[PDB]
Design a protein around this ligand. Sequence first.
Ligand SMILES: C[C@H](CCC(=O)N(CCCNC(=O)[C@H](O)[C@@H](O)[C@H](O)[C@H](O)CO)CCCNC(=O)[C@H](O)[C@@H](O)[C@H](O)[C@H](O)CO)[C@H]1CC[C@H]2[C@@H]3CC[C@@H]4C[C@H](O)CC[C@]4(C)[C@H]3C[C@H](O)[C@]12C
Ligand SMILES: [Br-]
Length: 56
Amino acid sequence: ETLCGAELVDALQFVCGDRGFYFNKPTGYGSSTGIVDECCFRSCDLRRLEMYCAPL
Ligand SMILES: C[C@H](CCC(=O)N(CCCNC(=O)[C@H](O)[C@@H](O)[C@H](O)[C@H](O)CO)CCCNC(=O)[C@H](O)[C@@H](O)[C@H](O)[C@H](O)CO)[C@H]1CC[C@H]2[C@@H]3CC[C@@H]4C[C@H](O)CC[C@]4(C)[C@H]3C[C@H](O)[C@]12C
Ligand SMILES: [Br-]
């Protein structure tokens, strides 16, 4: 059981609330896949899903 398309967006809107979400985690400067790969093509748990919520 995975989350794809609208189901995936519904889950993110519910879990992230008003924070917003991204499909790929930004890399940021001086740093040393995405949610579709982790949660739609593959099954992911709530903890991993919430990691795609933007910051407060
Ligand atoms: C279904 C959950 C999201 C929310 C959701 O999915 N809905 C909204 C629920 C409550 N919503 C609100 O509080 C809103 O304000 C609405 O009620 C409000 O009415 C509208 O915003 C107005 O635009 C879906 C609700 C479906 N909607 C309806 O049925 C109708 O809108 C209905 O209620 C009529 O409005 C009403 O009859 C009129 O009188 C998502 C969030 C996280 C997800 C789990 C993540 C971890 C695991 C991943 C696996 O790969 C699969 C397993 C899983 C356990 C996932 C399961 C599931 O995928 C979850 C529980
Ligand atoms: Br993104």
